[PDB]
Amino acid sequence: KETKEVYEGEVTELTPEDAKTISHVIVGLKSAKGTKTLRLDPTIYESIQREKVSIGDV
Amino acid sequence: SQSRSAKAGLTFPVGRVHRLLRRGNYAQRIGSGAPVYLTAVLEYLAAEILELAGNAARDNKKTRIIPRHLQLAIRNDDELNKLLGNVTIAQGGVLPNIHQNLLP
Amino acid sequence: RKETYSSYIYKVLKQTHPDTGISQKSMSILNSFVNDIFERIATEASKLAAYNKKSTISAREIQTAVRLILPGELAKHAVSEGTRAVTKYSSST
Amino acid sequence: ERLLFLRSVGERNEIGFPSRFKSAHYKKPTRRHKSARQLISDENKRINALLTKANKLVPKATYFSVEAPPSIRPAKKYCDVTGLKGFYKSPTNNIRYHNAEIYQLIVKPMAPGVDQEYLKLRGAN
Amino acid sequence: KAVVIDDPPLRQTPEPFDEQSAYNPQSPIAIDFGSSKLRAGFVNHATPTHIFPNALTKFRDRKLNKNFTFVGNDTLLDQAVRSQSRSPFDGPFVTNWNLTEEILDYTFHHLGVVPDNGIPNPILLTERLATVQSQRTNWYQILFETYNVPGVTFGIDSLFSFYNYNPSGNKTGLVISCGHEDTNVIPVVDGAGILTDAKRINWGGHQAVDYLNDLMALKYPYFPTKMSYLQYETMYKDYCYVSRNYDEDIEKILTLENLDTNDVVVEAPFTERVAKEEEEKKLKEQQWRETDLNGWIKDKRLKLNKLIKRRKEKLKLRDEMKDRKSQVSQNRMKNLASLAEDNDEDWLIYTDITQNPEAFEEALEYEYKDIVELERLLLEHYDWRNSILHLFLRGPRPHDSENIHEQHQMHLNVERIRVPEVIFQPTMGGQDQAGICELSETILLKKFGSQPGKLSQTSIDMVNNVLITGGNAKVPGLKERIVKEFTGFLPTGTNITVNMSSDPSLDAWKGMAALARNEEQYRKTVISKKEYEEYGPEYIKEHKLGNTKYFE
């Protein structure tokens, strides 16, 4: 038995902070029913930076 | 610094036509858009004539521009002939035209 | 310093037909043609300036004179290119 | 009857120089017209004069701080003729059109002096 | 069936006036000096007793040689006196104050006031947000000199309507007002308008009707009848609505099934051997048509199709010859120079290279006659639904150019939603400003100590009390669109309440009446004669319902 949890939408804020190692990344997501902000892991930030994700992408 | 022709993106001069407009006593006051408008019009007209002349010179399979090609370009084109229906040409010749009944 | 338009029409010929040369009689044809067009357009603009009690020649009078002199397709292309050049020159910021 | 009913209304609305609904001191002044374009001019010239006096302070609520700033998102492009979505823009007169038949029937054969008030609606002339 | 528009019908009964017996010289009097309408009436009533347009005519009689004066509803009596009405306003400001003085005298006469050395009642007046110093200087001058008023207060009509719908005077909310000449967004904290964060868009009802008039003038350049401002105002009032989603409605606004229900048509008001061989061929053709009509009809249809294909190829050749940059013109120039640079066949080629402008027309007429004969032989034995332009002008029906009634018709298909969209996208009207939703977003999400992502308590209280006012809020679909945008940019689960009255053009006067009925907070806003004589016309009374000072 497993569960699936998905966040998707348009990026409205991508602000990382360090200490040269990033501590955590705040990402803001937006959809048609509203918006929601998240805290994120540095490894997921590396995965975001791999995909060339900027402000305004889905 | 730099000239006004590159400021307006042209190759023809702007101060030269401003000077020629100035003491040409057309009027005692001349605005700033007057030489750039005249410069752009002269640009387009010279470019169109040079396009048709180069096409006629290539059409002759001969690598220079001879006034026979200028005559061919002037009279083959419709409204260039309308603009230049008054001026006689130097060393140009006459376009070949035979009326239909003279052919037997 | 006898003044003529030789270099400028040499380059605008050179941006479209690189391996082509001009004869000197032809060189004189383009020089006289440019001077004749300049004289016709400028005297029509001066006549239209004297039309309206106006002591200044601006771009609007020359646009009206270009629309008066040229045939129609040449006229609309000339005012299009001249308007683009004027808007290029005016927004020098 | 139409030429008399207006007179009958006009006599029911007498306003005189010694006005009942007015103070004793009229002292009817004379002013220049002062249209709406130069009211902005003398207002910001007065504001600039006060600010340059203060520099040799900070505004709070003037007519020009109330003005809305330009937007930060890109603006939508629409066809100038039909008002639909504008895919293409003509290179001669900078008119945005929808498709081919709009271009061939309107944008190409248009009279010269009609594109300017097509561009005046969005303020692009 | 196309509906017929015209001028609005004229008023019959003249404007009456209140009795002078009920007047008392101590009650205040409220005046809403609007750019489009004037609203005046005494404080003790709930609704104003005098509503009329802000207009004035200097009527001239040819017979009596007397200058008359018709104000407001009395200008709605003749067509000539309606068409020559003049407003004291010029844009968002007032230019000529003689018209305003005459209009104020008219409305003082109609209120049944018996004065003595000026008006004894204090007045309540509205003013524009961040008004020019000259305007308040002139207002102070004309009031305190020509009318001897004891007390004056100034305020914005948006804050008056907010006070009308929140009479406690200390609530927190957001005000959106769509006026005649501008649209404002004002945030309110604890009942006091925060005027350092208010914003204004230069667009109103007047610009919208002018936009519709310009669009109709550009759409139908050969319209034979001239339309007035009032007719375009009726078309703007009747058949304009705000779309739920403008970004996708324009993709399906010109389909055929959508145009069946969402198209409005508006009608302007107005008041021997060769002969024997030919006869034998005709007899043989008649015998073949009587013998085998199907085969003869098929052969005639094939001949007509071949003639049509030949005509299409000839028209394509004629169009291709007209292009100077085409390859056909280059081949013509190559052949012409080939006859000008270096036999009977070459002679025939030179004869065949001649210009045929009228010969092509004669050959096209002959081919049209041959196609007509082929169609007649087929009888004996270009769709407008694919044209976006035809759907744009003449809708989903075929068009008759010869019909006199169809020559005065006017269709409204894209302009029903294009006109009200300018308050959300001001760039379409020519103003380089942000829209309503953008300004509301940058107010709620980045001000009053609200970082983007979490809302402060002030922002939550602002969202929970959004009020829409103004005369231009009569457009349907506005509230649902604002609610959809607001829940678009806000965090999920945020409660959104949007309030709009039944008539959003009379809430300002009810705000004046509610402030004047509340005696305690009245006296913070009144300006006495001694106050104006002491601190001069350069004086701003800071209160919770009016303007503030220009600096800090």
Amino acid identity of residue E43, one-letter, is: V
Give the residue on C whose Cα is nearest the Cα of D93: C80
The DSSP line for E490-524 is SBTT----EEE-SSTTSHHHHHHHHHHH--TTTTT
Exposure on the CB side of residue E35, measured as CA atoms within 13 A:
22
**Which tokens in the block code for residue B58?**
């290539």
Question: Are the CB atoms for B33 and C86 separated by under 8 Å?
Answer: yes
Number of Cβ within 10 Å of residue D124's Cβ equals 14
Number of Cβ within 10 Å of residue C33's Cβ equals 21
* Terminal-to-terminal C-alpha distance of chain E: 63
Question: Are the CB atoms for E263 and E411 separated by under 8 Å?
Answer: yes
Q: What are phi and psi of E53, to 5 degrees?
A: -65, 150
Neighbours of chain A (3+ CB pairs under 8 A): E
Find the farthest-apart pair of alpha carbons in chain A and give their distance in angstroms, rounded: 40
Question: Are the CB atoms for E465 and E457 separated by under 8 Å?
Answer: no
Dist CA E511 CA E526 (whole Å): 16
The DSSP line for B38-92 is HHHHHHHHHHHHHHHHHHHHHHTT-SEE-HHHHHHHHHHSHHHHHHTSS---SS-
Q: Is the Cβ of A32 closer than 8 Å to some Cβ of chain E?
A: yes
CA distance D92 to chain C (A): 6
> Which residues face E320 on adjacent strands?
none
Pairing of β E264-267 and β E3-4: parallel
**Which tokens in the block code for residue C64?**
């009206």
**Cβ–Cβ gap C12/B37 under 8 Å:** no
Among E445, E463, E442, CA closest to E174: E463
Among E42, E95, E48, CA closest to E72: E48
Dist CA E139 CA C11 (whole Å): 68
Cα-based torsion angle of the residue sequence B54, B58, B64, B68 in order, rounded to the nearest 10 degrees: -80
Q: Is the Cβ of E437 closer than 8 Å to some Cβ of chain D?
A: no
Question: Are the CB atoms for E113 and E17 separated by under 8 Å?
Answer: no
Dist CA E517 CA E370 (whole Å): 90
Q: What are phi and psi of E509, to 5 degrees?
A: -65, -35
- Residue E230 buriedness (CB in 10 A; 0-12 / 13-18 / 19+): middle
**Cβ–Cβ gap B36/C21 under 8 Å:** no
User: Who among C37, C42, C59 is closest to B33 (CB)?
Assistant: C59
Domain ranges of chain C: 1-93
Dist CA E328 CA E313 (whole Å): 14
Q: Is the Cβ of E357 closer than 8 Å to some Cβ of chain A?
A: no
Amino acid identity of residue E233, one-letter, is: E
**Cβ–Cβ gap E77/D9 under 8 Å:** yes
> Which residues face B8 on adjacent strands?
none
Amino acid identity of residue E428, one-letter, is: M
Q: What are phi and psi of A13, to 5 degrees?
A: -155, 130
D-to-E residue pairs, Cβ atoms closer than 8 angstroms: 185
Domain ranges of chain B: 2-87
User: Who among B72, B77, B78 is closest to E337 (CB)?
Assistant: B72
Dist CA E24 CA E111 (whole Å): 11
Dist CA D97 CA E533 (whole Å): 63
Exposure on the CB side of residue C25, measured as CA atoms within 13 A:
12
Dist CA E363 CA E474 (whole Å): 62
**Cβ–Cβ gap E333/B95 under 8 Å:** no
Q: Helix (H) and strand (E) counts for chain A? A: 1, 3
Dist CA E302 CA E309 (whole Å): 10
Q: Do chains A and E touch (3 or more CB pairs under 8 A)?
A: yes
Cα separations (Å) of A21 from A18, A51, E469, E490?
5, 20, 52, 32
**Which tokens in the block code for residue C34?**
């440019």
Amino acid identity of residue E6, one-letter, is: D
**Cβ–Cβ gap C82/B37 under 8 Å:** yes
Residues of C within 8 A of D93 (CB-CB) are 80
Cα separations (Å) of D59 from D65, E201, E544, E552?
8, 20, 19, 6
- Distance from the Cα of residue E476 to its chain's centroid: 14
Dist CA A21 CA A42 (whole Å): 9
Dist CA E74 CA E53 (whole Å): 10
Cα-based torsion angle of the residue sequence E383, E384, E388, E391 in order, rounded to the nearest 10 degrees: -160
Note which residues in 68-97 of chain B have CB less than 8 A from chain E.
68, 72, 76-78, 95-96
Question: Are the CB atoms for E439 and E199 separated by under 8 Å?
Answer: yes
Contacts of E344 (CB under 8 A, 6+ apart): none
Question: Are the CB atoms for D59 and D65 separated by under 8 Å?
Answer: yes
Amino acid identity of residue E51, one-letter, is: I
Amino acid identity of residue E492, one-letter, is: T
Among A3, A1, A4, A40, CA closest to A23: A40
- Distance from the Cα of residue B60 to its chain's centroid: 20
Q: How big is chain D, counted in residues?
A: 125
Residue E61: helix, strand or coil by DSSP?
coil
Q: Is the Cβ of B53 closer than 8 Å to some Cβ of chain E?
A: no
Residues of D within 8 A of E414 (CB-CB) are 82-84
A-to-E residue pairs, Cβ atoms closer than 8 angstroms: 27
- What's the CATH architecture for C1-93? Orthogonal Bundle (1.10)
Dist CA E394 CA C37 (whole Å): 47
Ramachandran bin of A13, using left for φ above 0, alpha for ψ from -120 to 50, beta for the remaining angles:
beta
Q: What are phi and psi of E242, to 5 degrees?
A: -90, 125
3-state secondary structure C46-59: HHHHHHCCCCEECH
Cα separations (Å) of D23 from B7, D16, D26, E108?
65, 13, 6, 13
Among E226, E264, E209, E231, CA closest to E8: E231
Give the residue on E whose Cα is nearest the Cα of B57: E337
Q: Choose, out of C73, C79, C80, the residue to mutate when testing the contact with D (most D CBs < 10 Å).
A: C80
- Distance from the Cα of residue D89 to its chain's centroid: 28
Note which residues in 443-462 of chain E have CB less than 8 A from chain A.
452-454
Residues of C within 8 A of B37 (CB-CB) are 59, 62-63, 66, 82, 85-86
What is the helix (H) or strand (E) element at residue E416, kind and residue range?
A: helix E415-418
* CA angle E216–E219–E225, rounded 5-degree value: 60
Ramachandran bin of B61, using left for φ above 0, alpha for ψ from -120 to 50, beta for the remaining angles:
left
* Terminal-to-terminal C-alpha distance of chain C: 36
Amino acid identity of residue E35, one-letter, is: S
Q: Is the Cβ of E156 closer than 8 Å to some Cβ of chain D?
A: no
Q: Is the Cβ of C9 closer than 8 Å to some Cβ of chain B?
A: yes
What is the helix (H) or strand (E) element at residue E409, kind and residue range?
A: strand E409-412
Q: How big is chain A, counted in residues?
A: 58
**Cβ–Cβ gap A28/E452 under 8 Å:** yes
Dist CA C52 CA C46 (whole Å): 11
Question: Are the CB atoms for E547 and E153 separated by under 8 Å?
Answer: no
Dist CA E73 CA E505 (whole Å): 18
3-state secondary structure E172-202: CEEEEEECCCCEEEEEEECCEECCCCCEEEC
**Is CATH 1.10.20.10 the classification given to domain B2-87?**
yes
CA distance E29 to chain D (A): 14
Q: Do chains B and D touch (3 or more CB pairs under 8 A)?
A: no
User: Who among A28, A32, A33 is closest to E453 (CB)?
Assistant: A28
Helices (H), E292-409: 293-321, 327-338, 344-352, 357-380, 388-394
Dist CA C62 CA C82 (whole Å): 10
3-state secondary structure E107-157: HHHCCCCCCCCCCCCCEEEECCCCCCHHHHHHHHHHHHHHCCCCCEEEECH
How were these coordinates obtained? cryo-EM
Tokens 């400021």 belong to which residue? B7
User: Who among C67, C75, C80 is closest to D92 (CB)?
Assistant: C80
B-to-C residue pairs, Cβ atoms closer than 8 angstroms: 160
